[PDB]
Amino acid sequence: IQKVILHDVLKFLFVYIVFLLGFGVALASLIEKCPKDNKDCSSYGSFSDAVLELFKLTIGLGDLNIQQNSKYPILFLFLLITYVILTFVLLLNMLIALMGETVENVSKESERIWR
Amino acid sequence: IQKVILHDVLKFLFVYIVFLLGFGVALASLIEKCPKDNKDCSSYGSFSDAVLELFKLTIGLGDLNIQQNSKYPILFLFLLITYVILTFVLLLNMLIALMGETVENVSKESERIWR
Numbered sequence A, B: 001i002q003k004v005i006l007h008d009v010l011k012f013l014f015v016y017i018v019f020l021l022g023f024g025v026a027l028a029s030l031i032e033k034c035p036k037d038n039k040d041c042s043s044y045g046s047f048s049d050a051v052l053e054l055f056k057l058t059i060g061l062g063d064l065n066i067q068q069n070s071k072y073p074i075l076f077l078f079l080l081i082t083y084v085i086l087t088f089v090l091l092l093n094m095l096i097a098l099m100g101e102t103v104e105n106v107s108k109e110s111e112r113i114w115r
């Protein structure tokens, strides 16, 4: 666990941040007027809400409907399906990067530094 | 990440499209009359709704109830449990196809093209 939370996951965050914060603005700005007659107009409102409602998406949690008040419902989705794919690709770089670590190291690495 | 978004995932989409668009019609047509007295009769209405409510299923998101207005609630499910399995099989072809790529390449591939 320790050699794994030092070497691979720390990378994955650092690139998972920049996309989340990156794509976060893109969908947090495409949203437009919140008519006060219809308050809590959209989940993606301020930037703080965009980061989380994307965060809930990654873990496999919540609900989604491509109707949120925006200027471009066609562009408002292309940046979202984007975030699904681009996120997903790294998660496959995750399991293989640890796969390329465990078959070489564990049986000799763990038992010895344990001693 | 780059060698992975060129070679394996591009395949997985191209077969994930044809099933999604394929099974999308099958459940988008089996649905029938939307009585205007009972509007938003079903999630699977037009084809555009079928693609997404299947899309939300794949990522692990949303809600499901096998009651949606259809002619055949027995056939309306067999095409759905179908889409769960057939999708799932490719995702196992994913992790193994990258597994059959990483154990051969990474330690020599990445460090060298990086130079």
Ligand SMILES: CCCCCCCC/C=C/CCCCCCCC(=O)O[C@@H](COC(=O)CCCCCCCCCCCCCCC)COP(=O)([O-])OCC[N+](C)(C)C
Pocket (backbone or CB within 6 Å): A014, A017, A018, A021, A022, A025, A046, A047, A048, A051
């Ligand atoms: C590694 C990066 C750091 C890690 C952090 C880890 C923790 C994650 C961080 C989580 C923070 C979540 C939001 C905090 C709260 C809101 C305030 C805010 O920050 O935004 C404000 C201004 O800022 C913007 O609008 C942001 C625009 C710039 C994005 C910068 C990304 C840089 C990443 C580059 C990466 C380099 C990669 C280099 C590659 C070699 C706007 O916010 P607001 O709408 O006014 O606020 C809501 C109001 N409320 C709070 C009262 C409700």
Ligand SMILES: CCCCCCCC/C=C/CCCCCCCC(=O)O[C@@H](COC(=O)CCCCCCCCCCCCCCC)COP(=O)([O-])OCC[N+](C)(C)C
Pocket (backbone or CB within 6 Å): B014, B017, B018, B021, B022, B025, B046, B047, B048, B051
């Ligand atoms: C690779 C394929 C392309 C990739 C695309 C990637 C992006 C994904 C694409 C997403 C598009 C999502 C829907 C768009 C919006 C609706 C319009 C539409 O297209 O359908 C319309 C007609 O068309 C049909 O009814 C479709 C029937 C033919 C299916 C063709 C699949 C071919 C895949 C073969 C693969 C070959 C494999 C070969 C193997 C070697 C009906 O729609 P509607 O109900 O009238 O519209 C709703 C109305 N509203 C919008 C106002 C609400």
Ligand SMILES: CCCCCCCC/C=C\CCCCCCCC(=O)O[C@@H](COC(=O)CCCCCCCCCCCCCCC)COP(=O)([O-])OCC[N+](C)(C)C
Pocket (backbone or CB within 6 Å): A013, A016, A017, A020, A048, A049, A051, A052, A055, A058, A059
């Ligand atoms: C694929 C599965 C695996 C991976 C999954 C991904 C894993 C995680 C990856 C990455 C983290 C992703 C960011 C999530 C943040 C969502 C919430 C947000 O942005 O806004 C919300 C909170 O906002 C804040 O609290 C602002 C940030 C405060 C600083 C602390 C950051 C915590 C990270 C610590 C890192 C520890 C590192 C130690 C371990 C090494 C809303 O803003 P607000 O409105 O101000 O607050 C609401 C309440 N209020 C209105 C009453 C005030």
Ligand SMILES: CCCCCCCC/C=C\CCCCCCCC(=O)O[C@@H](COC(=O)CCCCCCCCCCCCCCC)COP(=O)([O-])OCC[N+](C)(C)C
Pocket (backbone or CB within 6 Å): A066, A067, A073, A074, A077, A078, A081, A082, A084, A085, A088, B013, B016, B017, B020, B048, B049, B051, B052, B055, B058, B059
């Ligand atoms: C297992 C986990 C990992 C894999 C997960 C799977 C990963 C993804 C796999 C595959 C993608 C799956 C398709 C999802 C589409 C759902 C929405 C839909 O069909 O209809 C909706 C939108 O419809 C549209 O927007 C129509 C399509 C527009 C073209 C852009 C396609 C974006 C793909 C870009 C590809 C980027 C490639 C770059 C990266 C290489 C509804 O139609 P509407 O009613 O017209 O719109 C509603 C709003 N309105 C009423 C206000 C207008």
Ligand code: NA
Pocket (backbone or CB within 6 Å): A059, A060, B059, B060
């Ligand atoms: Na899940």
Ligand code: NA
Pocket (backbone or CB within 6 Å): A060, A061, A062, B060, B061, B062
């Ligand atoms: Na879920």
Ligand code: NA
Pocket (backbone or CB within 6 Å): A095, B095
């Ligand atoms: Na694995």
